[PDB]
Design a binder for this molecule. Structure first.
Ligand SMILES: Cc1cccc(C)c1Nc1ncc(-c2ccccc2)n2cncc12
Length: 271
C-alpha cells in the first residue's frame, strides 16, 4: 500500500526529536513530540547500516499487532532518514527500571502483577499466530503508571504452520533461548514461553543476568543433564515451579501464555 496513501506515513515536520535515549549500529532512538503536544519515541535508521526494507518490516509487522499490552505503532517516515514513531514509554526498559529507586521499592505483589501483564501481552501474540523470539526484560517497556508492554519486534514473525526455522548460521542469546531454537533453529510460541520463564527470573531478581555463575557452555551442559536454574535468591517457591513448567524438555509440554497469565493473576491477587 503506497506511501501517498499510507494512513501510517507522516510529514517529517510533524515531529520534534528532543532527547536521544540510545545509539548503536543500526541508528538512534529519540523521545520527541508529534505536532507539538504528544510525546513519542522515534527510531531512525543509520543509512547504509542495514536495509531500509528490513528496518521497516518491524513497522509493517506492528501494523498487524495492536493491543494495549503491545507498544503501539504511531507512524512512519519512509525517506531521507527513515523514522519509526511509536507510543512513548516513560519508564524505559523493565530490566533498567527494576534497578532504580522506584523499581527497588516494588513489592513482590507488584512484580507478580507486572509479570502477568507481560504474559497477557504474549497471550495476544500467541493467539494472533505470531512469535516474538526476543523475549527478555530488556524488551519489555514500562509506562508512567507502572504498566508493562511488549517491545522490540526485530525478530517477531507470523507463522503459516507452527515452525519458523532460522538460517543455519544464526546466533541468539543463549541464556534466554530455548534448546531447540539454539540447536535446530526451530522457534514456536513454546520457545517464547521458555524465555518468558527466564524473564520471570529477571523480574524477581531485579536486574540480574540469569544462571548466576555460569558461562554459556556451562549453562548448556547443565540443561542437558536435566537441571534448571538454581532458585534465584528470594524467589517465591510457587513462581519458581511456574518457571519450571516454562522449562519443560519438550515444547508441547510447555504451558500456554493464557494459562501463565491466568496463574500469575491468582498469585498476584492472592497477595
Ligand atoms: C520507537 C520504536 C520503534 C520500533 C519498536 C519499538 C518497541 C519502539 N519503541 C521504543 N523503543 C525504544 C525505547 C527506549 C530505548 C532506549 C531506552 C529506553 C527506551 N522506547 C521508549 N519508549 C518507546 C520506545
Amino acid at each position: 500500500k503506497p506511501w501517498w496513501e499510507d494512513e501510517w506515513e507522516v510529514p517529517r515536520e510533524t515531529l520534534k526529536l528532543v532527547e536521544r535515549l540510545g545509539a548503536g549500529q543500526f541508528g538512534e532512538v529519540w523521545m520527541g513530540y508529534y505536532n507539538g503536544h504528544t510525546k513519542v519515541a522515534v527510531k531512525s535508521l543509520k543509512q547504509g547500516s542495514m536495509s531500509p526494507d528490513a528496518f521497516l518490516a518491524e513497522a509493517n509487522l506492528m501494523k498487524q499487532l495492536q493491543h494495549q499490552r503491545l507498544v503501539r505503532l504511531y507512524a512512519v517516515v519512509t525517506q531521507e532518514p527513515i523514522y519509526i514513531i511509536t507510543e512513548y514509554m516513560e519508564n524505559g526498559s523493565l530490566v533498567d527500571f527494576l534497578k532504580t529507586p522506584s523499581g527497588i521499592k516494588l513489592t513482590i505483589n507488584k512484580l507478580l502483577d507486572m509479570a502477568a501483564q507481560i504474559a497477557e501481552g504474549m497471550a495476544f501474540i500467541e493467539e494472533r499466530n505470531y512469535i516474538h523470539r526476543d523475549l527478555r526484560a530488556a524488551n519489555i517497556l514500562v509506562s508512567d503508571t507502572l504498566s508493562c508492554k511488549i517491545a522490540d519486534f526485530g525478530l517477531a514473525r507470523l507463522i503459516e504452520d507452527n515452525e519458523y526455522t532460522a538460517r543455519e548460521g544464526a546466533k541468539f542469546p543463549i541464556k534466554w533461548t530455548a534448546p531447540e531454537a539454539i540447536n535446530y533453529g526451530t522457534f514456536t510460541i513454546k520457545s517464547d514461553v521458555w524465555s518468558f520463564g527466564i524473564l520471570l527470573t529477571e523480574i524477581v531478581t531485579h536486574g540480574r543476568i540469569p544462571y548466576p555463575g555460569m558461562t554459556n557452555p556451562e549453562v548448556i551442559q547443565n540443561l542437558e543433564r536435566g537441571y534448571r536454574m538454581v532458585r534465584p535468591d528470594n524467589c517465591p517457591e510457587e513462581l519458581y515451579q511456574l518457571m519450571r513448567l516454562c522449562w519443560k524438555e519438550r515444547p508441547e509440554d510447555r504451558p500456554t501464555f493464557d494459562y501463565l497469565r491466568s496463574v500469575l493473576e491468582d498469585f498476584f491477587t492472592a497477595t
